[PDB]
Amino acid sequence: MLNLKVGIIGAGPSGLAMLRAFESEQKKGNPIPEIKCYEKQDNWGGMWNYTWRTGVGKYGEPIHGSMYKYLWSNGPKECLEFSDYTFMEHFKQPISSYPPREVLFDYIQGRIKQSNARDFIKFNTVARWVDYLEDKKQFRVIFDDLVKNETFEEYFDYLVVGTGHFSTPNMPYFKGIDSFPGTVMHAHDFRGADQFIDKDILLIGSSYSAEDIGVQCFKHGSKSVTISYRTNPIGAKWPKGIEEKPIVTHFEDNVAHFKDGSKKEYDAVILCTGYQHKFPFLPDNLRLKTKNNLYPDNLYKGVVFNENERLIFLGMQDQYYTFNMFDTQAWFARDYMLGRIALPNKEIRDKDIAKWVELEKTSVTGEEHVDFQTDYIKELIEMTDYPTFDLDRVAEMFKSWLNDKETNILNYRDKVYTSVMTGVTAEEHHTPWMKELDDSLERYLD
Amino acid sequence: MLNLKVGIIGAGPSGLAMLRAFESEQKKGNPIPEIKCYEKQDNWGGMWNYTWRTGVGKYGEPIHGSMYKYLWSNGPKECLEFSDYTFMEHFKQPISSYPPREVLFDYIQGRIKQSNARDFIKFNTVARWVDYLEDKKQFRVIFDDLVKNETFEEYFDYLVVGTGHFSTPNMPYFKGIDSFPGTVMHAHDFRGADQFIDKDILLIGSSYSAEDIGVQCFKHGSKSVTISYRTNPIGAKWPKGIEEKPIVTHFEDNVAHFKDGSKKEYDAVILCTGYQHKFPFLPDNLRLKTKNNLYPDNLYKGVVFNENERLIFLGMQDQYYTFNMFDTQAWFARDYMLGRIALPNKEIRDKDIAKWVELEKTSVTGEEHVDFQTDYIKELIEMTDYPTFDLDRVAEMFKSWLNDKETNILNYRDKVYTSVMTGVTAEEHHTPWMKELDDSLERYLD
Ligand SMILES: Cc1cc2nc3c(=O)[nH]c(=O)nc-3n(C[C@H](O)[C@H](O)[C@H](O)COP(=O)(O)OP(=O)(O)OC[C@H]3O[C@@H](n4cnc5c(N)ncnc54)[C@H](O)[C@@H]3O)c2cc1C
Ligand SMILES: Cc1cc2nc3c(=O)[nH]c(=O)nc-3n(C[C@H](O)[C@H](O)[C@H](O)COP(=O)(O)OP(=O)(O)OC[C@H]3O[C@@H](n4cnc5c(N)ncnc54)[C@H](O)[C@@H]3O)c2cc1C
Ligand SMILES: NC(=O)c1ccc[n+]([C@@H]2O[C@H](COP(=O)([O-])OP(=O)(O)OC[C@H]3O[C@@H](n4cnc5c(N)ncnc54)[C@H](OP(=O)(O)O)[C@@H]3O)[C@@H](O)[C@H]2O)c1
Ligand SMILES: NC(=O)c1ccc[n+]([C@@H]2O[C@H](COP(=O)([O-])OP(=O)(O)OC[C@H]3O[C@@H](n4cnc5c(N)ncnc54)[C@H](OP(=O)(O)O)[C@@H]3O)[C@@H](O)[C@H]2O)c1
Question: What is the CA radius of gyration of chain A?
Answer without folding.
Answer: 22
